[PDB]
Amino acid sequence: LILLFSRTALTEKCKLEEDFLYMAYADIMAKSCHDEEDDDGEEEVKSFEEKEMEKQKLLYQQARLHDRGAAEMVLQTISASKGETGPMVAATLKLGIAILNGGNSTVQQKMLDYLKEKKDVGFFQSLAGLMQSCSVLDLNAFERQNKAEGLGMVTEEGSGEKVLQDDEFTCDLFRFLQLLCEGHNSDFQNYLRTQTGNNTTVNIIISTVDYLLRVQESISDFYWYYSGKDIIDEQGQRNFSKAIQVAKQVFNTLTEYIQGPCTGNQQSLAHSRLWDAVVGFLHVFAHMQ
Amino acid sequence: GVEIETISPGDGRTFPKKGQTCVVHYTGMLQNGKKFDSSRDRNKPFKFRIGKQEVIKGFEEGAAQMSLGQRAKLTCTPDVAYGATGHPGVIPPNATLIFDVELLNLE
Amino acid sequence: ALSKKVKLPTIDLPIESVSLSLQDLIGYFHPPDEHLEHEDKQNRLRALKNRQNLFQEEGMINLVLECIDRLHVYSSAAHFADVAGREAGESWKSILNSLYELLAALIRGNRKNCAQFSGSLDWLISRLERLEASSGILEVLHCVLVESPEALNIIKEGHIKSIISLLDKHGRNHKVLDVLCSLCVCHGVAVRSNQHLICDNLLPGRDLLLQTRLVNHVSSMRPNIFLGVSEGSAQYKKWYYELMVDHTEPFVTAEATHLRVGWASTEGYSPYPGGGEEWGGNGVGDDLFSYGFDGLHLWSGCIARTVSSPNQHLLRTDDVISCCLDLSAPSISFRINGQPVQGMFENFNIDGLFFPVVSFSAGIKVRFLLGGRHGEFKFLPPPGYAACYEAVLPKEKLKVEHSREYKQERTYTRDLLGPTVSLTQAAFTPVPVD
Amino acid sequence: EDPELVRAMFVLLHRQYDGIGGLVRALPKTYTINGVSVEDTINLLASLGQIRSLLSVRMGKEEEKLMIRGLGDIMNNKVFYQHPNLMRALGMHETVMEVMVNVLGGGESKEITFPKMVANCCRFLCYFCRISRQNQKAMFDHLSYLLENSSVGLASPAMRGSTPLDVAAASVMDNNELALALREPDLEKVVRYLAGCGLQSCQMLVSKGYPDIGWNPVEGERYLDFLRFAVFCNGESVEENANVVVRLLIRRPECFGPALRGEGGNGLLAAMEEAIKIAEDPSRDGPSPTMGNAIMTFYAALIDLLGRCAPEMHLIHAGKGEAIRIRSILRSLGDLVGVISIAFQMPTIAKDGKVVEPDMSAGFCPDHKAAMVLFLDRVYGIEVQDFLLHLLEVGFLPDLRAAASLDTAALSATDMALALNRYLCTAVLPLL
Amino acid sequence: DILELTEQEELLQFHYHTLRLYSAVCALGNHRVAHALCSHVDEPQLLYAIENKYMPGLLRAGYYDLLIDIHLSSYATARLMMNNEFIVPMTEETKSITLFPDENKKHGLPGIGLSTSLRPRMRFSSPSFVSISNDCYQYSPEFPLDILKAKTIQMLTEAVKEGSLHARDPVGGTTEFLFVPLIKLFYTLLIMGIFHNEDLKHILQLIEPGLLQMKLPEPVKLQMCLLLQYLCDCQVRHRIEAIVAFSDDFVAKLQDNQRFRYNEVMQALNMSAALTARK
């Protein structure tokens, strides 16, 4: 099955098909590896009798999935879409974060070896396209949606929002980036900026900084729009929570990029447009508080 | 128009009239032994009614001589056929047709 | 540079170098040889498609195809070969086929570029005006049909008739049909702008229409009585035998019901179930050399030779059949129910030998009445005639045989019968000596 | 081997494991017809099956006739307009869209110029909007591509200029939510499409050359009509769309001025007189025995769009809602102030008389005057005594004509009196 | 002859490509080409070609594909396209449908059941080559299905009996050339609802113990997957019919209960739209 998916993704199409079977099986695998609840749940359980067993079972499930070549399948499926946002890319990223949970190192080594031995160029370009295709708060869309059928949702057209086109997809993509670079992986940290073996170099760091600047500008514009009001709407609460979660995920991804001592990544951060983003965030915080 | 070569004995008293269906189990045949359609391999009766000219006039001109239970060999002039080109796809142009019409029942 | 019939030693004409270049180019466009692994095959296919698209864009926005068409000045088999150098078009067919194959491969590409060979009429009619090779046209039509079907509207009734006429003057090659399959639905990818027009136009031409037959199986029956007629030492010339039929229902399976009581020529007609361009024939009165007698119709080789006689009817129940034989003066007349019929047969196969035979189909019952106690003659023999009994050999009993076929329907035993037409091998004649 | 085999195998395995998924997917397709209407549903199902069978293959000469016959058979359907939910869930609109893509093909070829299915299907699908607006919501997604390929020439009214804009107009007929859901890029697209109609005209009707039909050109009015439908509502003017529409229209000059000088143009005081002197006595062409209505109709459509684009005053915001800036901008486009003289003239001439003389072909229409008075009411209004003291009437010549044209005659009346009556009905200037 | 083509390689290819052309010209529905093709090949010829044993494998598959593309092409395609609509009418006979035939919650036989859906009309044609305006049709000739079903069942039983023995010499050509066209014909006859209840019972009992136990090649597995998909689709259709049959009674009870409660403030009291209607 994994060979079938890999050979379907390897053959060029210049178009992302539907492939409902791929979606169903990626969802099945992601739910199979999602044994944990990632919440409080029960009371304070002891942290060695069950925690070690849970880690061992997660490692066993990840080994079962990736011993057949799941990592190569995920990389090929990501590189297949030439920077086009699609549900199949979302399913692939969900599978990636499902098999990369816990900061596994064997899958990271396998992906790095595959990328080095194949000299792939479409992966980084696809990642840059996905970053450029991400969404923002879209203040004008929220303003238009606020005034509907006189006031509110009197028309009852549907339960949709049309205020953040891709927020779960963006969070999944950045969680995949963080997990893929987790564990102070120095070679993988340096591989996202240089690509020495590759003929064409794409800087993921600058794209991440640009996306952070974009979301900071969007949040500041939302605050400036809402500065005249006094009470918080429920839609305002949901949009604020989504924006805060996306910004927190981007910040975590940036921390994992330079968590270990990496001179090149630190200099790239310093020479980027980070400082304007931090200035805007501080300006937002000083009045949010 | 048509030549009637009887190949079976007939009573000669019962004749097909106008306004009633006639059961005919024939077998078409082109020239030099070729054929194109048979109406007995399907094992179904072929019933047609006289008056609306839904069938070619060759059958009408050929069924006015033989009686019930009499098998005859028919020949169709291209002038009395469909036309200069005939039926497109099964009849060649300017070609005569051979039939083996037979009357069994009259209703 | 040598198109204008210039002097040969002035500017060189390196046929060997251009042949080597063409061979290297054709081997350079090799199909990816899919028997190897998927990764390398996919890489080769991607490189080939990108190369072909780029070559297209670089080449025939305004060039390449014009150069190839100007190169195609070979309109004579050997005149231009002799006029310019020793030979010019020694291998024109192979290079033309390979050039069209590479052209179609370039047209395929990434399924996004089909303009020159699919949106024009002059180049298509220039291709169709020669009609020597069909590999390139099939490839380009198949690729257009796969990508986006829009090159079939160019194909008109004239092109279809020209392609069909290729099967008439030139023998079948199974490639024309594989092309006409590509001018059809091809399981979904169809356009009814003109493809259905030409599909309906395939039928009235009747140069593609084929005829199929379905005939019942029949066998020939002969007794052991051999005439053994010779020249100079003849013994008997008169014979008379009759047969009876009781169950003779027609329409058992179809109109193809065979029931013949006459004779067929020994030389020319053989017990073979098929063969021949003119439908062959495996019964009496089936071939051109026989006549047959069903009582009404005497066709031979699909030729209308019916006779006229009063009270014409099939060989129904209680209908006698009589036969007459003569050797000095050819005069054969057939009498049914006491009334002789017309159709006198003259100058039969006097030279040689012939045997009494009869053909029959399924669901028939016939009786043999040769004479004596075995055969009771219903009607009296004509004057000057003798019954078919005097030609009985001693120390044997007359019976019927299998008419020199191979094997009948046997369940357990599986015997093989060797070459034995009759009692002798060289000639079937008596031995009068002095 | 044979990866299609393993693909089908695992598809079947997953589908048989996840029966709940098949159950939830199949249920929206299901419908339920009651009793008697089975017979009329069978014919509809057969017609749709024939359409779907012809969908995969393309259309030619007789196939267009077959499709039109099938559509004529499907129009006289009882349960067509009685079960809109079945019509939406049965996926006909996707079939018609795919047929449209097949007909258009690559584009800029127009092998067959006979769009009649699309207009009838769109109008009959969008006529009902009180129930199951989800069909219009679905067509809103296709609206972007539909506006992308807005070709010229519609066979149903024998007009040219915009083939599929009727579908868009029916899509934004009376839906305020759909109008609010409109975005900026498609408005930019239609603005650039309108900006391309600035080329001058030499003959009575010519696109590039070799004219065929020279009755009446309307190629410049369809875009304005679509913008008017997208900027207004049943009884309200959407300000969010109006602001971006007027900003895009004012950002670049696209209205060519055949009588003014310099950049800009849009001079009514000369162009209207040129139109009424070139269209009343002569034909649409210059040299003609004793442009046409196209230029004046285009100007009236632009005026209607601008008037409906102006924000409503003293109804929601009166001087405290940023509308002052846009009102001043609209006022700056004086020639626009001095349109009362334009509204005063009555260039119709009823002619007629004693010896029959029926039918008019080059008559001024009162709808254009209604457009001028609507623009005046929307922008300036009659809230001040100055306008009443300057005009004292909606019009002297039209009112005198209406007073004179009052007789029980089948030839003098029922030809122009209806238009004047409608124009007087639409005149609310003396009101308020 | 007819069997001499097993030696002549070129003539066998010629005839196979002629059959492929005949299949390709008349496909995806056609008006007059089907009749002209039926002029050349008739019912008894096709029946003997599909029932013969010594016939070459290529010609057998060609004749099978020709028969399917002439007769069972348009109707089967139309039914396949409509099979994803699930339009269930409400009459007096559509209420007697349950999820299980008994109270034991038995799964039951997927093939046998009561559908009461909106099936298309099976209207054939009887042209006899002397007629006019013969365009709306399904079958150019009148195939006798009563003997066709029996022939198909008999040949399927013979084929599975031969394959159970695992003979070295197959029927035609090899083990797949005799088996792929037979399953193709059986599948394209089963999807059209031609088979009756007893034929469905025989088919189900044929594979219940087995057809899936021996070794099969790839195309036979493809055909088996298609048959299983059709069976599961029939099960889904039965489930949907049972669901809507229960839903009619449930919504009737809900309407009765809502009518029992008195809550009306509109001027048009006791109106039908007060139960279930937006306005």
Curated annotation (Swiss-Prot), chain B:
Catalytic activity field: [protein]-peptidylproline (omega=180) = [protein]-peptidylproline (omega=0)
Entry keyword set: Cytoplasm, Isomerase, Rotamase, Sarcoplasmic reticulum
Entry-linked InterPro entries: FKBP-type_PPIase, PPIase_dom_sf, PPIase_FKBP_dom
GO MF: calcium channel inhibitor activity; calcium channel regulator activity; FK506 binding; peptidyl-prolyl cis-trans isomerase activity; signaling receptor binding; transmembrane transporter binding
Activity-regulation annotation: Inhibited by both FK506 and rapamycin.
Cellular-component GO terms for this entry: calcium channel complex; cytoplasm; membrane; sarcoplasmic reticulum membrane; Z disc
Organism superkingdom: Eukaryota
Cross-referenced PROSITE patterns: FKBP_PPIASE
Tissue: Detected in heart muscle (at protein level). Isoform 1 and isoform 2 are ubiquitous with highest levels in brain and thymus.
Protein's GO biological process: 'de novo' protein folding; calcium-mediated signaling; insulin secretion involved in cellular response to glucose stimulus; negative regulation of calcium-mediated signaling; negative regulation of heart rate; negative regulation of insulin secretion involved in cellular response to glucose stimulus; negative regulation of release of sequestered calcium ion into cytosol; neuronal action potential propagation
Role of this protein: Has the potential to contribute to the immunosuppressive and toxic effects of FK506 and rapamycin. PPIases accelerate the folding of proteins. It catalyzes the cis-trans isomerization of proline imidic peptide bonds in oligopeptides.
Oligomeric form and interacting partners: Identified in a complex composed of RYR2, FKBP1B, PKA catalytic subunit, PRKAR2A, AKAP6, and the protein phosphatases PP2A and PP1. Interacts directly with RYR2.
Designated name of the protein: Peptidyl-prolyl cis-trans isomerase FKBP1B
Upper classification of the organism: Eukaryota, Metazoa, Chordata, Craniata, Vertebrata
Gene name as annotated: FKBP1B
Curated annotation (Swiss-Prot), chain C:
Tissue-wise expression: Highly expressed in heart, lung, cerebellum and brain. Detected at lower levels in adrenal gland, stomach, thymus, esophagus and ovary.
Processing after translation: Channel activity is modulated by phosphorylation. Phosphorylation is increased in failing heart, leading to calcium leaks and increased cytoplasmic Ca(2+) levels.
Cellular localisation: Sarcoplasmic reticulum membrane
Gene knockout outcome: Embryonically lethal. Embryos die at about 10 dpc, due to defects in heart tube development. Cardiac myotubes display enlarged rough endoplasmic reticulum and cytoplasmic vesicles that contain high levels of Ca(2+).
Boundaries of every B30.2/SPRY domain copy: 165-375
Domain notes: The calcium release channel activity resides in the C-terminal region while the remaining part of the protein resides in the cytoplasm.
Assembly with partners or alone: Homotetramer. Can also form heterotetramers with RYR1 and RYR3. Interacts with CALM and S100A1; these interactions regulate channel activity. Identified in a complex composed of RYR2, FKBP1B, PKA catalytic subunit, PRKAR2A, AKAP6, and the protein phosphatases PP2A and PP1. Interacts directly with FKBP1B, PKA, PP1 and PP2A. Interacts with FKBP1A and FKBP1B; these interactions may stabilize the channel in its closed state and prevent Ca(2+) leaks. Interacts with SELENON. Identified in a complex, composed of FSD2, CMYA5 and RYR2.
Protein purpose: Cytosolic calcium-activated calcium channel that mediates the release of Ca(2+) from the sarcoplasmic reticulum into the cytosol and thereby plays a key role in triggering cardiac muscle contraction. Aberrant channel activation can lead to cardiac arrhythmia. In cardiac myocytes, calcium release is triggered by increased Ca(2+) cytosolic levels due to activation of the L-type calcium channel CACNA1C. The calcium channel activity is modulated by formation of heterotetramers with RYR3. Required for cellular calcium ion homeostasis. Required for embryonic heart development.
Family of this protein: Belongs to the ryanodine receptor (TC 1.A.3.1) family. RYR2 subfamily.
Name of the protein in question: Ryanodine receptor 2
Organism field: Mus musculus (Mouse)
Upper taxonomic lineage: Eukaryota, Metazoa, Chordata, Craniata, Vertebrata
Residues of the full protein shown: 435 to 868 of 4966
